[PDB]
Amino acid sequence: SLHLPKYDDFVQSISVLALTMSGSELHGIMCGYLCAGADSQGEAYIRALLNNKKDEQSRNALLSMFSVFSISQQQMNNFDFEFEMLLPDDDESLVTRAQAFSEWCEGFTQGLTIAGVGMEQFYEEESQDALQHLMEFAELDCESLEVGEEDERALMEVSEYTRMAVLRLHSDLVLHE
Amino acid sequence: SLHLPKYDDFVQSISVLALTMSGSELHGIMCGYLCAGADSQGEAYIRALLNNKKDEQSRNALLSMFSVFSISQQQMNNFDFEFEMLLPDDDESLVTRAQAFSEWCEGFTQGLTIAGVGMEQFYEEESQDALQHLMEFAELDCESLEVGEEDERALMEVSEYTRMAVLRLHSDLVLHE
Ligand code: NA
Ligand code: NA
């Protein structure tokens, strides 16, 4: 097996960068590049987040983002390894987890786009349907969600749907053209 | 990078088993099992090919078959590795190489069938069309093939179509269960 780091470890490891987005959004962005097979472009994007800074903290942040990118690259490209979305732990609040899920999708869709992939690049119709749903998940209002069984289940379902959809989109893009 | 052994070396390595089929057909079978996710079942098949012999030469034949099965498993499951079909080298006759391609396809479609995969197990229409083409390639007249560039590029094109198709078939099966 091969697993992403704990969510809060990752978040702490990039805190010094004072980024404008969540760990989850950032991971969604990485996975957008990787889904499109724009691996080298993803790496360049991560480098760019340092804005040329060269101190040891910034450097350690870079190494951590690269470790995550490489784990994701392997999970997305090897059927022997389960693909994971970097999201807060299950004991966080429903509202925290739902916002992070939405930001994950926003990052992923933006990543795809910046990597030159939209609706027309997909061979399968299942993929286009899925991209559209991810675009809706990205626009999701986390405050409507209500604590209890129903919405926990709802979040769990859309989260698992998104996880698989990313893998199917990736196969579509990679095995055509 | 990770590559299959040379056709000749593999064929020599299994000659002691006196198999009824060619190296290419056997590799097709292996890939049928792998495409279906029936890895353990394929392994038991390969082991049963020794018909319980335990002598050194038979055991080395088995090691060779397992090495090929494992290389294939990795190529089919890791997008970072190129998938290969085990086919005779270019030097050999056009008829001979067309024959081996056909036997590869026959082996492949038999492997799928044995592992419980036919038309209805595939989610995408494209996969179904591809399987149908592969069944036709298995029943292909190799004598008609005229030594020349037209039929040489004809063979190359269905060979490459088959190579890519196998990967798309696999992704269809794994990503819908
Ligand atoms: Na995987
Ligand atoms: Na591969």
Among residues A159, A24, A27, A162, the alpha carbon closest in space to that of A100 is found at A24
Cβ-contact B97, B151 below 8 angstroms = no
Structural domain span for residue B141: 1-177
Among residues A173, A107, A101, the alpha carbon closest in space to that of A140 is found at A101
Instruction: Give the integer Cα–Cα distance in Å for B115 and B108.
Output: 11
Neighbours of A63 (CB within 10 A): 11
Centre of ligand 1 to C-alpha A70, Å, is 13
Q: Considering only alpha carbons, which residue of chain A is nearest residue B73? A: A80
- Considering its fold, how many domains does chain B have in total? 1
**Token digits for A95?**
């509202």
Among residues A21, A48, A24, A42, the alpha carbon closest in space to that of A117 is found at A42
CATH number at residue B137: 1.20.120.740
Instruction: Give the integer Cα–Cα distance in Å for A69 and A34.
Output: 9
**Token digits for B8?**
């000749």
Cβ-contact B3, B74 below 8 angstroms = no
Instruction: Give the integer Cα–Cα distance in Å for A129 and B99.
Output: 42
Instruction: Give the integer Cα–Cα distance in Å for A49 and A69.
Output: 14
* Ligand approaching nearest to the C-alpha of B80: 2
Report CA dihedral (A79, A85, A91, A94) to the nearest 10 degrees: -130
Kind and range of the H or E run holding B141: none
How many degrees, rounded to 5, is the angle at CA A109 between CA A105 and CA A114?
145
Neighbours of A119 (CB within 10 A): 10
Instruction: Give the integer Cα–Cα distance in Å for B27 and A89.
Output: 45
Q: Specify the residue for token string 């209805």.
A: B120
Q: How was this structure determined?
A: X-ray
Q: Counting one residue from A and one from B, how many pairs have CB atoms under 8 Å apart?
A: 29
Centre of ligand 1 to C-alpha A78, Å, is 4
